[PDB]
From TrEMBL, chains A, D, F:
Name by which UniProt lists this protein: Genome polyprotein
Subunit structure: Homodimer. Interacts (via N-terminus) with host EXOC1 (via C-terminus); this interaction results in EXOC1 degradation through the proteasome degradation pathway.
Organism: Tick-borne encephalitis virus
Function, as annotated: Involved in immune evasion, pathogenesis and viral replication. Once cleaved off the polyprotein, is targeted to three destinations: the viral replication cycle, the plasma membrane and the extracellular compartment. Essential for viral replication. Required for formation of the replication complex and recruitment of other non-structural proteins to the ER-derived membrane structures. Excreted as a hexameric lipoparticle that plays a role against host immune response. Antagonizing the complement function. Binds to the host macrophages and dendritic cells. Prevents premature fusion activity of envelope proteins in trans-Golgi by binding to envelope protein E at pH6.0. After virion release in extracellular space, gets dissociated from E dimers.
Subcellular location field: Host cytoplasm, Host perinuclear region; Host endoplasmic reticulum membrane; Host nucleus; Secreted
Automatic annotation (TrEMBL), chains B, C, E:
Organism (species): Tick-borne encephalitis virus
Role: Involved in immune evasion, pathogenesis and viral replication. Once cleaved off the polyprotein, is targeted to three destinations: the viral replication cycle, the plasma membrane and the extracellular compartment. Essential for viral replication. Required for formation of the replication complex and recruitment of other non-structural proteins to the ER-derived membrane structures. Excreted as a hexameric lipoparticle that plays a role against host immune response. Antagonizing the complement function. Binds to the host macrophages and dendritic cells.
The protein's name in its UniProt record: Genome polyprotein
Residues of the full protein shown: 281 to 709 of 3414
S-S bonds: 3-30, 60-116, 74-105, 92-121, 186-290, 307-338
Taxonomic lineage from the root: Viruses, Riboviria, Orthornavirae, Kitrinoviricota, Flasuviricetes
Subunit structure as annotated in this protein's UniProt entry: Homodimer. Interacts (via N-terminus) with host EXOC1 (via C-terminus); this interaction results in EXOC1 degradation through the proteasome degradation pathway. Interacts (via N-terminus) with serine protease NS3.
Subcellular location: Host cytoplasm, Host perinuclear region; Host endoplasmic reticulum membrane; Host nucleus; Secreted
Length: 75, 496, 496, 75, 496, 75
């Protein structure tokens, strides 16, 4: 029933202890670097459909960074 | 007539020469069989269970921590080391604290610290998984004759018979009293896949939760919690519920992540319930395929005389069953036993009887009888029992009937999968195609996309349709449009 | 049946009227041979050995040094000399030291200095090669009949009979008890190539090492250690474990290169193990080609009565062997010597018994019996033994069976090489082209590339293919493409 | 006592217990990552000079795909 | 004159105005100062040591194993576990035995097996690292004044003086009797890098190995072996000397990979040797920048009388030193305290003295004297000591001497690197250009190719230059020819 | 299994006793020559095929030295 969304990195006491240090940037980069070695074959399908369907290296690179940043948000 | 007590009911039919019917019976479902000139029967699956299934893993939901100890070393004095690092039932971490003159070290720099604590589970805070053995499961099938008497839900009917099926059984024969014998065969393998189900137990003494849950096995192996198998004293992976503070010079805090019970009960939202009763562990979802043979069944009371047409009175007036049938009950004062002269008619002709009775050859007994169930066509009607007459107006239409019977078929197909093609008293060629297409195309979808989340499946289907519109090749374009539609239809057919 | 104990089981069958079958038998394998109206028989190779094979080279793993001496001479006094430069078992070096008035010479310049040390082996530090003689090798083939009874890995089955083979004794007849006689012909030529194979012994006494390794002769001839033949008191090339310090004035240091500076670990990784048992030197990876005659075999108990159908109970309920077969055991009570009325049936037409019995004509005898092995079609079946009946679900499909039999086939090629074609209940003309192509291409690949490592074989194959694409001549281009692709494929042939 | 060659992986019959396992490409390709991830550093960029040197995509990919299994294998 | 005994000697010239000189003293070398109007001095670095350096890691080179144990459980009966699996000082493996009815299981399938064994090092088979402390290291420098007296490499010069330098020591003075005082400064921060250097000790009592080796820290910190720190009882790396055989049904065998001493000593090929002397740990390769001051020095005996020219007789006649100098020893029969009339003449021109003496103002004294050393021009010369004469042919040429100083410069610049520019009686502006350009261009090579091996450095340098012949622009062609040539030039000197 | 890679040869300051002279040209040249004396048929095939196939003396010399120096290295 009850749902409790954990809040953003807004309040930041600069020199005191955190609780569990869920610092999202380095944590999500670590999650992405885990996902691309555990689920390694699926990246070939994602890069090839982008490489085939988008008409420039600029638009290919622009989606691939976003797609790989999104990849571990789903299963 | 137990089929009248339930919200789900299926009707099956046949000619004199049919002799055998194939059914899929389901927990919470019910079937009435109406073969030409045979006494009608209700058939249902009452229970699927084992006594004392074997335990798989135990998991801990609330870590208890005690007797923490810590040890630390100056810069360049090597690693800190402590006895509790080499025991069962302890969890430990080592880190580099900052040191200098202000905490009794000769050099300024990174030292070494190790922190240890004992770990256990609080007294009732386990989850236990249980798994079935196909050699020990009992399926219970029950049969009831349409005796023409009404016994309510929550009271006992003398005519019910029980067959218990286990892997060591063939056909069984039940003597349905004076109605003769019914022959019944259960395929105990297939349908439910017993290798993929775990019955999950938390605590049976808690007043406000189900006693167990029917969890999937691939999910239960991936629970990120501390675990063990039965009889062991130590817990594996205890570091999943302790997390350690940043180090000070000569101390380091141990924090407990607390009782996980609520997170588990949220993660189980959408998993069917299961029930524990002394030694028994019941499923409350599942199915079995049966072949039922009618050949030895006897019509009761064909030799008897007619009632006096004048001596009837109603006890329950004609009322809608909700299953497209009319239900009624009569009381009689003549000589017994005897046959009830029941018929129904439409204003277009007084001679043609239009009653399709469910109760065959209804009678009054010396100590029972008098209930009738029947189906009438659409429109305006009169029901006769001798000199008793009652008007009726049957709801719906012939096209409305074709719709509801088609709709209920789609519910079997989505809930039961390929076993939906086995339900019926007679064959027909398109059933061979339908099973092939379902097992091929549903097998492909389950192979390629099976475990993927609902919104990701929609996004992939919509992306396939977008590729179908945008890619220049016309053969690939049409193939992406067709396959994206099939992916979306099967996805929307299971939901979230 | 000993055939049920191993994962590496095999089956081959004699057709109607076929009296002979040809087998390849291997130390880690077991073959059940079945033929119409003959008792099923299991055959395997239990040992390949010789007693006290001939010593070849001894090599030294750890040098002992002692009694070092040195002599040196002032500039222009000519070369320094010792008696020890002429003896056996001494290592020496002759070198020049800078000299002057500070180290009691009359002139500044270069003198001459010679240093010596005795060389020996430490007490148990020798690597010994031993080689087989074809005239004294013993192979050992064993046979077991399907007596309808069961035994563990650690039980003595009375039906096992044994036959030793060596070049003077190729053929033997065995009396299998009431099952009649079986005839074995073993060629002791073919089999393990005893010209290429060396058995390497270090020290039998070591608690935590295998007693021997099965090393290749061309590798063993190249070990860069000190070495000798048996009985010699002095070591060839003893300088390969001694190094000499740079000379200073009138002194020069001598150094070892150390304990176990030799063969163990990373050099021998991937070599098959061998075993030494008193006087016997066994191989533990190897084969023989053997012909079995099935003429003189009898089936027991065709004159018996069938069991009284009600009087069975299960001793071991049906289970899956892992070899695509079902195994079960029954107890009986009544008149002792009897046939067991075994059959099984599908959900098709009920008259068709579908069971292929692997135990032909099963019985209970006075002392024991009632084990059965059978094979069934895929899907859903009921198994019967009189009035005992038990449902069964068979895994896989008619296509899945074939893919498994194909993988077993390819694996026997990759292990055995060209002799793999002699495994069969037939020897027809197509086996001659099969062996001819395997003889030519196997000999060619062995001749060019036999000592080349896995990675450089792939690099050569990639170079051949890429040169084949870059060649301007189409005949050379195509030959390089075909040979490069073949070299890659047969390099990668280490498994399936 | 140096340059004892590693035993060849072929011609010896299998189907019984071996001493250890190794030296096929399945194993050997994984050994050199422990140098590339810590010592190669700036020289990891040499993929660019190989790519800019050779004539075409198919030849650049072919030379890089083979170089990766032999070029760092100096010991 | 101790600096004549070594193969390695150098000369620094102090022209008037030179009150102080800067040296880079090295182990295995000697420097002589020849100052205009002041006595010549021998100066050298004699030891670099610490008493009892701090222990770092201990490794074990040869495993001892004992008390092996195994436990297993049937398929589906849950994973196996054993009490030693959580203790310190044990190695364990968890694996899946194949099991079935032949091996006393109820089902055919993969079971569970666990195996255990204890581990220890054999009594002498350790490798111990030690590390230096910059606040406790001692550098020893020695000086010896040219007394004109010669004593061998195995006896004690009376005028030899010692200075022992630590981080505590300032500029220190040595009083040399009648020659005055020498004033001397050693810079402990300007020598060996104690952060990157480790001393490796195996067993000292092994009669035919050096007592210690010097190794780089980022090699010693990542060897793949069992490791520990002092006084701990148990070994602390996931075991690399122990290995586990493929599992049988109910048994699994443990293997020991034996003594690694031979593969360690091979991997150390190329490292400097060190020495251990009681409690003292000595480096045997190393240097210190050191500054020596001369204003307090006096020539002894400048007021003394001349000798009787007629009373000299040879004690050791003129011979070549190997350093391009002539050495001799004379005896005198007159009243002893006096100045020796040494001179030398180019043959045919007695007007010009060509004796460049290394001993300034030679004398006889009551206790000893009469050693002389000089440098003469190539060709025919006469040497005089009063009325004694001898005729000397000086080998060589003016070009050969310039080449010899050139070679000796490149040698020190190759061995010592950036610090080699600080060697001399001068510090003029060009030396700042040299040290700056060496720091930048050498630092680029050390940054980009640090730790790359000798062969792959050559292959990369040759490849970069060779591709430089065919690059797409002449600027790149030139830049990769120049940088490829620089890489080879650094590598083929000593940059391995 | 235990692996102890060789110490880098040029990193330490000299002018005292070194334990042994390094592998240098000595171990490499004798390792390469010894392989040509053993795999004679393949070595002759490789040099003759390369000489008959590649289109310049300089690219032949490069490929011949590369194929020789990387063949014996797997020990
Ligand atoms: C979600 C909580 C459900 C609790 C419950 O009561 O779960 C039961 C058991 O869930 C299920 O069978 C779910 C099966 C999923 C596949 C509710 O469905 P049911 O008992 O009516 O069975 C199904 C009766 N058909 C066949 C007439 C619809
Ligand atoms: C509507 C809610 C039920 C969805 C359902 O019954 O969905 C699928 C239906 O399967 C089919 O063959 C659909 C074939 C369609 C053509 C089964 O359940 P599932 O795979 O989503 O979950 C795991 C299984 N449990 C829910 C029983 C634990
Ligand atoms: C089941 C149908 C045959 C499966 C199979 O691929 O079997 C293969 C044979 O066929 C093949 O195509 C082999 C292709 C490779 C050559 C394995 O036959 P095998 O295990 O009896 O080995 C003995 C095979 N001899 C009877 C021919 C000696
Ligand atoms: C198409 C061939 C499929 C079977 C196969 O792959 O047969 C392989 C490679 O094919 C051939 O030789 C083609 C001709 C024979 C089939 C048989 O030779 P192998 O890979 O075991 O090499 C030799 C193995 N010794 C070193 C143990 C002898
Ligand atoms: C040209 C020869 C110049 C004199 C000489 O031979 O100069 C060399 C020094 O230049 C070389 O090595 C480079 C020679 C290039 C040709 C001997 O100088 P040095 O023995 O005093 O060594 C230390 C000399 N620092 C302090 C100037 C480094
Ligand atoms: C161009 C800059 C050269 C600097 C220099 O004089 O380079 C030399 C290297 O000369 C050569 O090998 C070529 C010598 C023949 C000419 C010194 O520098 P290094 O890095 O080899 O230091 C010395 C090595 N340690 C750092 C390991 C002690």
């Amino acid at each position: 029933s009850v749902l409790i969304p954990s809040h953003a990195q807004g309040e930041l006491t600069g020199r005191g202890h955190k609780w569990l240090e869920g610092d999202s940037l380095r944590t999500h980069l670590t999650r992405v670097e885990g996902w691309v070695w555990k689920n390694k074959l699926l990246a070939l399908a994602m890069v090839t459909v982008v490489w085939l369907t988008l008409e420039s290296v600029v638009t290919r690179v622009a989606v691939l960074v976003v797609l790989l940043c999104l990849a571990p948000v789903y299963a | 007539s137990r089929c009248t007590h339930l919200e789900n009911r299926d009707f099956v039919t046949g000619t004199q020469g049919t002799t055998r019917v194939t059914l899929v019976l389901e927990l919470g479902g019910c079937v009435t069989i109406t073969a030409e000139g045979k006494p009608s029967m209700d058939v249902w699956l009452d229970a699927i269970y084992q006594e004392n299934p074997a335990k798989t893993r135990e998991y801990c939901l609330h870590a208890k921590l005690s007797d923490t100890k810590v040890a630390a070393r100056c810069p360049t004095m090597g690693p800190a080391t402590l006895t509790e690092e080499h025991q069962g039932g302890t969890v430990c971490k080592r880190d580099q604290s900052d040191r200098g003159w202000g905490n009794h070290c000769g050099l300024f720099g990174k030292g070494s610290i190790v922190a240890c604590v004992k770990a256990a589970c609080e007294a009732k805070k386990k989850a236990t998984g249980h798994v079935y053995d196909a050699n020990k499961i009992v399926y219970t099938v029950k049969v009831e004759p349409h005796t023409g008497d009404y016994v309510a839900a929550n009271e006992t009917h003398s005519g019910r018979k029980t067959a218990s099926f286990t892997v060591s059984s063939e056909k069984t024969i039940l003597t349905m009293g004076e109605y003769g014998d019914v022959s019944l065969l259960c395929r105990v393998a297939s349908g439910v896949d017993l290798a993929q189900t775990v019955i999950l137990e938390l605590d049976k003494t808690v007043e406000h939760l189900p006693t167990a849950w029917q969890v999937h096995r691939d999910w239960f192996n991936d629970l990120a919690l501390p675990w063990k198998h039965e009889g062991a004293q130590n817990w594996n992976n205890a570091e999943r519920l302790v997390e350690f503070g940043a180090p000070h010079a000569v101390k380091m805090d141990v924090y407990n992540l607390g009782d996980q019970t609520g997170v588990l009960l949220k993660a189980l939202a959408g998993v069917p319930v299961a029930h524990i009763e002394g030694t028994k562990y019941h499923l409350k979802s599942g199915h079995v395929t049966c072949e039922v043979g009618l050949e030895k069944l006897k019509m009761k009371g064909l030799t008897y005389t007619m009632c006096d047409k004048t001596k009837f009175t109603w006890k329950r007036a004609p009322t809608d069953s909700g299953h497209d049938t009319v239900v009624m009950e009569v009381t009689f004062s003549g000589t017994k036993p005897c046959r009830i002269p029941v018929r129904a008619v439409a204003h277009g002709s007084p001679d043609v009887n239009v009653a399709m009775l469910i109760t065959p050859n209804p009678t009054i007994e010396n100590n029972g009888g008098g209930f009738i169930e029947m189906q009438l066509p659409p429109g305006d009607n009169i029901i006769y029992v001798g000199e008793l007459s009652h008007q009726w107006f049957q709801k719906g239409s012939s096209i409305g009937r074709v719709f509801q019977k088609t709709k209920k078929g789609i519910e079997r197909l989505t809930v039961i999968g390929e076993h939906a093609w086995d339900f019926g008293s007679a064959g027909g060629f398109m059933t061979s195609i339908g099973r092939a297409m379902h097992t091929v195309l549903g097998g492909a979808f389950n192979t390629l996309l099976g475990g993927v989340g609902f919104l990701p499946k929609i996004l992939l289907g919509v992306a396939m349709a977008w590729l179908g519109l945008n890619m220049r090749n016309p053969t690939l374009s049409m193939g992406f449009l067709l396959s994206g539609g099939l992916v979306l239809a099967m996805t929307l057919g299971v939901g979230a």
